[PDB]
C-alpha cells in the first residue's frame, strides 16, 4: 500500500527528483488534516459494530434476502455478510487514515467481484448496504469526515461493479 506521503515520495523518486513545490504542497495538505483523520478513526473504532448493525437494519433486514432462499439466510451466511461489512468499514478507515485508496485495491478488491460472482453473493444488495454504512458513519464523524469516508466506501462499491 501507499499513503498520501509515500505516494508523493514514489512519484518524485521515479523522476529522480527532490521534492518540488507541487509535492511539498501535497505533503502540507496531508499534515494539516492528520489529526482530523485520527479523530474520525477513533470514533469509528469505538462504534464499528453499531455502524454495521444500523446499516444492516436500514438496507437488508425483513426482506427476501434474509428469508429462506435469500443469500443472507442461514446463520453462516448472515455472519459472512456482516463480516464483509465489518471488513469494508475497517479498510475504508485505513484508507481514510492513509488519505489514499491503494490499500483497497491491494487488500479488498483484488479478485473480490470474481469471488462474489462464483458464490452468488448479490453485488446490488452489498452496494446498498455500503451506502447505508456511509450514511450512518457520516452521522457519527460529522460532514467533512463523512464525505472523506464516502470517497473510500464509493471506491469499494465501484470495485464490485
Amino acid at each position: 500500500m501507499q499513503d498520501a506521503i509515500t505516494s508523493v515520495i514514489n512519484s518524485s523518486d521515479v523522476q529522480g527528483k527532490y521534492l518540488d513545490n507541487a509535492a511539498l504542497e501535497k505533503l502540507k495538505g496531508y499534515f494539516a488534516t492528520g489529526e482530523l483523520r485520527v479523530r474520525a478513526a477513533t470514533t469509528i473504532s469505538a462504534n464499528a459494530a453499531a455502524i454495521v448493525k444500523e446499516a444492516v437494519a436500514k438496507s437488508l433486514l425483513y426482506s427476501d434476502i434474509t428469508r429462506p432462499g435469500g443469500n443472507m439466510y442461514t446463520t453462516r451466511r448472515y455472519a459472512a455478510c456482516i463480516r464483509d461489512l465489518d471488513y469494508y468499514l475497517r479498510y475504508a478507515t485505513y484508507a481514510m487514515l492513509a488519505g489514499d485508496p491503494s490499500i483497497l485495491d491491494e487488500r479488498v478488491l483484488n479478485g473480490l467481484k470474481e469471488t462474489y460472482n462464483s458464490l452468488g453473493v448479490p453485488v446490488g444488495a452489498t452496494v446498498q448496504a455500503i451506502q447505508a454504512i456511509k450514511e450512518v458513519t457520516a452521522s457519527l464523524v460529522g460532514p467533512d469526515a463523512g464525505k472523506e469516508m464516502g470517497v473510500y466506501f464509493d471506491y469499494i462499491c465501484s470495485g464490485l461493479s
Binding site: 505533503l27 478513526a41 464499528a48
Partner: protein, 160 residues
C-alpha cells in the same frame, strides 16, 4: 511512513489501529511542518552538501581515487558524486516520511550486492554519506540535526 507501518501492523492482527498507534500518527503529523523545513534545507543546499562530502571522503579513502581505484578519473568521480546525490535525495524522503522505509526500499535492499558487483568499496560509500551528515548538520539546529542524523546513520550502518 509511520501511518503505513501502523496500518500494516493493525491489518496483520485484523484490528483497528490501537490508541498508541493513533497517538504516534498524531505526534508524527504535528511535526510535519518542521520535517518539511529540514528536507527543504537539505534540498536547497544539495550541490554544496554533495561537493564538500566528496572532498572530505577522498581524504579518508585515498584508495578509491588512486589509480586502480573505483572512482579514478573525472568521469568515475562524477558518477561517485551522482550516487551521493541519490543518497541525499533518499534522506530527504526519509525525513518527510518519519521513517527509513523509503530509503530502505529505494537505496538499501540489495545495496551490498550492487556495489560488490561494481567493485565499489561500500565502506567508502558509507564514509561519503557520513561526510554529507557532517556538512548538513552545519545547516541545522541541534534538534533538527538529531532528526536528520537518524536517516544518515541508518544509511551508514546499512553499508558498514
Amino acid at each position: 511512513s509511520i501511518v503505513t507501518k501502523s496500518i500494516v501492523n493493525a491489518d496483520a492482527e485484523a484490528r483497528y489501529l490501537s490508541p498508541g498507534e493513533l497517538d504516534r500518527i498524531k505526534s508524527f503529523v504535528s511535526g510535519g511542518a518542521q520535517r518539511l523545513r529540514i528536507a527543504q534545507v537539505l534540498t536547497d543546499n544539495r550541490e554544496r552538501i554533495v561537493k564538500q562530502a566528496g572532498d572530505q571522503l577522498f581524504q579518508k579513502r585515498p584508495d578509491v581515487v588512486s589509480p586502480g581505484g573505483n572512482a579514478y578519473g573525472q568521469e568515475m568521480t562524477a558518477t561517485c558524486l551522482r550516487d551521493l546525490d541519490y543518497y541525499l535525495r533518499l534522506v530527504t524522503y526519509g525525513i518527510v516520511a518519519g521513517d527509513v522505509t523509503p530509503i530502505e526500499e529505494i537505496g538499501i535492499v540489495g545495496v551490498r550486492e550492487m556495489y560488490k558487483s561494481l567493485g565499489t568499496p561500500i565502506d567508502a560509500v558509507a564514509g561519503g554519506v557520513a561526510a554529507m551528515k557532517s556538512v548538513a548538520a552545519g545547516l541545522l539546529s541541534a534538534e533538527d540535526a538529531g532528526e536528520a542524523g537518524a536517516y544518515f546513520d541508518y544509511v551508514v550502518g546499512a553499508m558498514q
